[PDB]
Amino acid sequence: AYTKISDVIVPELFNPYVINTTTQLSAFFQSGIAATDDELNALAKKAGGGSTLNMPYWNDLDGDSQVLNDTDDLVPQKINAGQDKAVLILRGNAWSSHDLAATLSGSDPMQAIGSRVAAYWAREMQKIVFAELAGVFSNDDMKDNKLDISGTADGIYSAETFVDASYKLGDHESLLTAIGMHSATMASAVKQDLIEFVKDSQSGIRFPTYMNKRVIVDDSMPVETLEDGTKVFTSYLFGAGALGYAEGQPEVPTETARNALGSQDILINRKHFVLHPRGVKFTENAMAGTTPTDEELANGANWQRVYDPKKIRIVQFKHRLQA
Amino acid sequence: AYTKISDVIVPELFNPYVINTTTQLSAFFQSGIAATDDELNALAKKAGGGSTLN
């Protein structure tokens, strides 16, 4: 058909392009990390492959002073040690196309299919991490200091409960940046409050703002239902700075192959990456595997945290939607 | 069959320690107390040690 950079498969000149555009286009960003610690490098790249390491830490000395008084002596004190974990995950999928369609629309090879696949993974992470918090951080007594709800049919989501939730970190404020928002909410928001369209990029328009924050319109969210048609939403609020990840490399990032007896040709991607909040430690219990983790069971149960209280940093409030 | 990751040996990993912080931010300075006068300069150093003057 054409020069076919992918269909005659130049593996160079292509894969770096795809990865980078995948990074910039997707947002989030930021919010979350850019270029996390090389810790996740040593977990990602070869050599010393996964699964994940464990890294330690020394909590700070603490204790009372003692009465300094003669005719008595002192007693010394000690330090402790602690543990931390991460995970590693793998992904991939195919494409069933016929090169007739792929470069039918594609035509000029460079921008077309690359831009597409980029936009693809851009949504993929947005699905995976946003699923990663989901069960864990909500289900425990251990985080409850970070969850408050107005639910059970008195609460409005406006102008007050938002503030109080935003102060659920007592001393530490003004580290928070982005507000995760499902659509219908922000609908109820434009219906009432002052939510203020702010134009930064000159000249471009614009990312919406609530109060010195960046709200984020996001399609896929949790939602539940009770009887009596009453609804409940989640809408995480963090803008922490940050989560973390590092890209890492597989072998054969791009592969082109075809089948003689039928008529097809297909594509594959299969990228590695390492992402996890630091944040709670990860463990192994009562799960399948391994590795990588999962989706479902990579959420449903069994995480364990140690810091604790501050510098997590994420908070959730389930609120009912305004009448 | 396969190369089959199940049957090949995986190492594990570590890397250096990092100090952890404990947080309750202690400032409550400046305030009383701060920026002292010299009366206590007379009650601190030797000679003529404590206890307190009047």
Query: Does A70 contact B at CB distance below 8 Å?
Result: no
Q: How far is CA A123 from CA A127, A171, A298, A304, in A?
A: 6, 35, 19, 28
Q: Is A304 buried (19+), middle (13-18) or exposed (0-12) by CB count in 10 A?
A: middle
Tell me which chain A residue has its CA closest to the CA of residue B26: A171
How many CB atoms sit inside 10 A of residue A183's CB?
Answer: 12
Of A181, A310, A312, A303, the closest CA to residue A234 belongs to: A181
What whole-number distance in Å separates Cα of residue B39 and Cα of residue B52? 11
Residue B10 in contact with partner chain A when CB distance is under 8 A = yes
With contacts defined as CB-CB under 8 Å, which chain A residues touch B26? none
Q: Which amino acid is at A134?
A: A
Q: Is A55 on the interface with B (CB under 8 A)?
A: yes
Minimum Cα–Cα distance from A306: chain B residue: B20
Summarize chain A as % helix, strand, coil (round to 5). 25, 15, 60
Tokens of A160: 């007050």
Q: Other C-beta atoms within 10 Å of A158: how many? A: 14
Distance from CA of A289 to the nearest CA of B (A): 11
Interface test with A, best of B18, B24, B26 (most A CBs within 10 A): B18
